[PDB]
Scaffold this active site. Sequence first.
Site, mmCIF file in Angstrom:
data_model
loop_
_atom_site.group_PDB
_atom_site.id
_atom_site.type_symbol
_atom_site.label_atom_id
_atom_site.label_comp_id
_atom_site.label_asym_id
_atom_site.label_seq_id
_atom_site.Cartn_x
_atom_site.Cartn_y
_atom_site.Cartn_z
ATOM 1 N N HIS A 93 0.682 -1.140 0.093
ATOM 2 C CA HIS A 93 0.127 0.030 0.059
ATOM 3 C C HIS A 93 0.870 1.201 -0.201
ATOM 4 O O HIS A 93 0.405 2.379 -0.386
ATOM 5 C CB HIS A 93 -1.230 -0.140 1.320
ATOM 6 C CG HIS A 93 -2.060 -1.174 0.875
ATOM 7 N ND1 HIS A 93 -2.915 -1.124 -0.180
ATOM 8 C CD2 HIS A 93 -2.566 -1.920 2.007
ATOM 9 C CE1 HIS A 93 -3.667 -2.139 0.154
ATOM 10 N NE2 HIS A 93 -3.493 -2.458 1.470
ATOM 11 N N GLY A 121 -2.641 2.140 4.864
ATOM 12 C CA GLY A 121 -3.072 0.663 5.200
ATOM 13 C C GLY A 121 -2.006 0.157 6.119
ATOM 14 O O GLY A 121 -1.958 -1.015 5.880
ATOM 15 N N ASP A 143 -3.267 -11.052 -1.558
ATOM 16 C CA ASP A 143 -3.718 -10.275 -0.518
ATOM 17 C C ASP A 143 -5.286 -10.025 -0.654
ATOM 18 O O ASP A 143 -5.537 -9.858 -1.845
ATOM 19 C CB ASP A 143 -3.138 -8.996 -0.091
ATOM 20 C CG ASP A 143 -3.373 -8.411 1.145
ATOM 21 O OD1 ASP A 143 -4.497 -7.785 1.460
ATOM 22 O OD2 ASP A 143 -2.742 -8.523 1.992
ATOM 23 N N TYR A 160 -4.778 -10.975 10.007
ATOM 24 C CA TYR A 160 -5.131 -10.328 11.555
ATOM 25 C C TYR A 160 -5.495 -11.423 12.461
ATOM 26 O O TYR A 160 -5.483 -10.937 13.449
ATOM 27 C CB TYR A 160 -5.891 -9.127 11.183
ATOM 28 C CG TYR A 160 -5.319 -8.160 10.189
ATOM 29 C CD1 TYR A 160 -4.395 -7.337 10.404
ATOM 30 C CD2 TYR A 160 -5.824 -8.364 8.988
ATOM 31 C CE1 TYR A 160 -3.714 -6.532 9.436
ATOM 32 C CE2 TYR A 160 -5.221 -7.363 7.781
ATOM 33 C CZ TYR A 160 -4.253 -6.467 8.280
ATOM 34 O OH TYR A 160 -3.770 -5.620 7.079
HETATM 35 O O1 LIG Z 1 -4.548 -5.769 4.858
HETATM 36 C C1 LIG Z 1 -4.466 -4.772 4.337
HETATM 37 N N1 LIG Z 1 -3.971 -4.584 3.295
HETATM 38 O O2 LIG Z 1 -3.512 -5.731 2.542
HETATM 39 C C2 LIG Z 1 -5.149 -3.675 5.254
HETATM 40 C C3 LIG Z 1 -4.973 -2.335 4.727
HETATM 41 C C4 LIG Z 1 -5.765 -1.458 5.669
HETATM 42 C C5 LIG Z 1 -6.270 -2.377 6.546
HETATM 43 C C6 LIG Z 1 -7.606 -1.727 7.538
HETATM 44 N N2 LIG Z 1 -7.227 -1.738 8.848
HETATM 45 C C7 LIG Z 1 -7.897 -2.743 9.890
HETATM 46 C C8 LIG Z 1 -7.241 -2.330 11.228
HETATM 47 C C9 LIG Z 1 -6.202 -1.552 10.865
HETATM 48 C C10 LIG Z 1 -5.364 -0.726 11.732
HETATM 49 C C11 LIG Z 1 -4.422 0.145 11.109
HETATM 50 F F1 LIG Z 1 -3.875 0.571 12.067
HETATM 51 C C12 LIG Z 1 -4.490 0.614 9.844
HETATM 52 C C13 LIG Z 1 -5.469 -0.147 8.888
HETATM 53 C C14 LIG Z 1 -6.413 -1.164 9.499
HETATM 54 S S1 LIG Z 1 -7.918 -3.305 12.157
HETATM 55 C C15 LIG Z 1 -8.731 -4.401 10.948
HETATM 56 C C16 LIG Z 1 -9.818 -5.420 11.280
HETATM 57 C C17 LIG Z 1 -10.595 -5.780 10.460
HETATM 58 C C18 LIG Z 1 -11.810 -6.471 11.053
HETATM 59 C C19 LIG Z 1 -12.199 -6.825 12.138
HETATM 60 C C20 LIG Z 1 -11.126 -6.047 12.999
HETATM 61 C C21 LIG Z 1 -10.191 -5.466 12.740
HETATM 62 C C22 LIG Z 1 -9.016 -3.671 9.593
HETATM 63 S S2 LIG Z 1 -5.864 -3.660 6.585
HETATM 64 K K LIG Z 2 -4.434 -8.519 -3.748
HETATM 65 ZN ZN LIG Z 3 -4.900 -6.991 3.006
#
Ligand SMILES: O=C(NO)c1ccc(Cn2c3c(c4cc(F)ccc42)S[C@@H](c2ccccc2)C3)s1
Ligand SMILES: [K+]
Ligand SMILES: [Zn+2]
Length: 399
Positions: free
Chosen positions: A142, A150, A178, A313
């Site tokens: 990203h 992200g 991803d 995650y």
């Molecule tokens: O995987 C990615 N790229 O490939 C991502 C880019 C941006 C993202 C969004 N994303 C999320 C979190 C987070 C924390 C951050 F400080 C920055 C971006 C974040 S908590 C996570 C989550 C989702 C469902 C339920 C609970 C928690 C989603 S994830």
């Molecule tokens: K992808």
């Molecule tokens: Zn992702």
Amino acid sequence: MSVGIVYGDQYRQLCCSSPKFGDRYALVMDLINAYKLIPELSRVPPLQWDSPSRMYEAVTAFHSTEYVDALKKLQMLHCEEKELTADDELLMDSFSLNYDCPGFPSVFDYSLAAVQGSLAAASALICRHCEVVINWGGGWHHAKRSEASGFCYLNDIVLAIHRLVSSTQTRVLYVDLDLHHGDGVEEAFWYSPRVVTFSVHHASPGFFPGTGTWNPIFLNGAGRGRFSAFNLPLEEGINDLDWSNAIGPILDSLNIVIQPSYVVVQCGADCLATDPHRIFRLTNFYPLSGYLYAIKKILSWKVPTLILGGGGYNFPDTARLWTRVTALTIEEVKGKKMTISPEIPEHSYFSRYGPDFELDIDYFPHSIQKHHRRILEQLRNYADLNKLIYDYDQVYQLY
Ligand SMILES: O=C(NO)c1ccc(Cn2c3c(c4cc(F)ccc42)S[C@@H](c2ccccc2)C3)s1
Ligand SMILES: [K+]
Ligand SMILES: [Zn+2]
Ligand SMILES: [K+]
């Protein structure tokens, strides 16, 4: 040939220093070690520089000097606990180092460590020391030239690919598995026909980052890089088999037409059914996991390959998938069967895999044609623009 993997005491500490990913890297590497895979793997040490100037030159091969300066300053400010000034807040906001990409005491060292790992992995492939190198500390697709996005601050992938194409006509195929669109890597090589980017992802109104779909035409690169950016947006709920059938013919056709010198695979684990995103329904099952299907197909090409991490995650399930990916890579490259016990072996993080303590993730699995036709046309257009000769029948029959 040899299978490389990036690790080290400092690398482990730095990759585990982020508040978002916590100790995920530690769990992944310890599960790999607990399944006795490390003696099969050649340790690739993270790249280190001889001066701050040489580090800046390497990182500013993609990122702006002012962005790297701002990221360093953000680390300094978070180290010596003191509120940010109004001008500091304004500077950090201008580089999107605010909301989704907050500061923390090790933000620059954490971000740089991923670059050191992936650059070292690229070098190991270039000098033909390993046929495949794995970096579970990398895969941050990203990050933009002058923008964090992200929880990606520096784009280790873009810098790794740049080093691969800069080596001695070199062509690199980037595959992004991803859940999220690989916008940063795609944008970086938007004008290059030597780096072909292919992202398979979820896209839906308001879903991060919003790209890699219709905007009602498909953008696929510009100038000399026209037709060189491929995207497969998929709807919510897709399982191992449909995901595999969706991407299989695309990967086969891209390999055949491009004939890449190197393949870089982002293997973000947030497509897993048990990821908190709860969008895709992929697994880590090996008798088939879509991830393992894709990796096995890519490795079957016998092209020097870089495998990186990224999203994921559910930390234990991300570890379960990436341990299976590391075992499969050893099997496919070294030709050596790596037997893996269904029961998680006793180790430091054993309790984290409760309450079942099994390697298989706890899940029971249960429009694409139009994208396939569009991607077949785009691949024909790409080949025609770059004057690449290939069997049109052979590629057609794959779909
Ligand atoms: O995987 C990615 N790229 O490939 C991502 C880019 C941006 C993202 C969004 N994303 C999320 C979190 C987070 C924390 C951050 F400080 C920055 C971006 C974040 S908590 C996570 C989550 C989702 C469902 C339920 C609970 C928690 C989603 S994830
Ligand atoms: K992808
Ligand atoms: Zn992702
Ligand atoms: K491109």
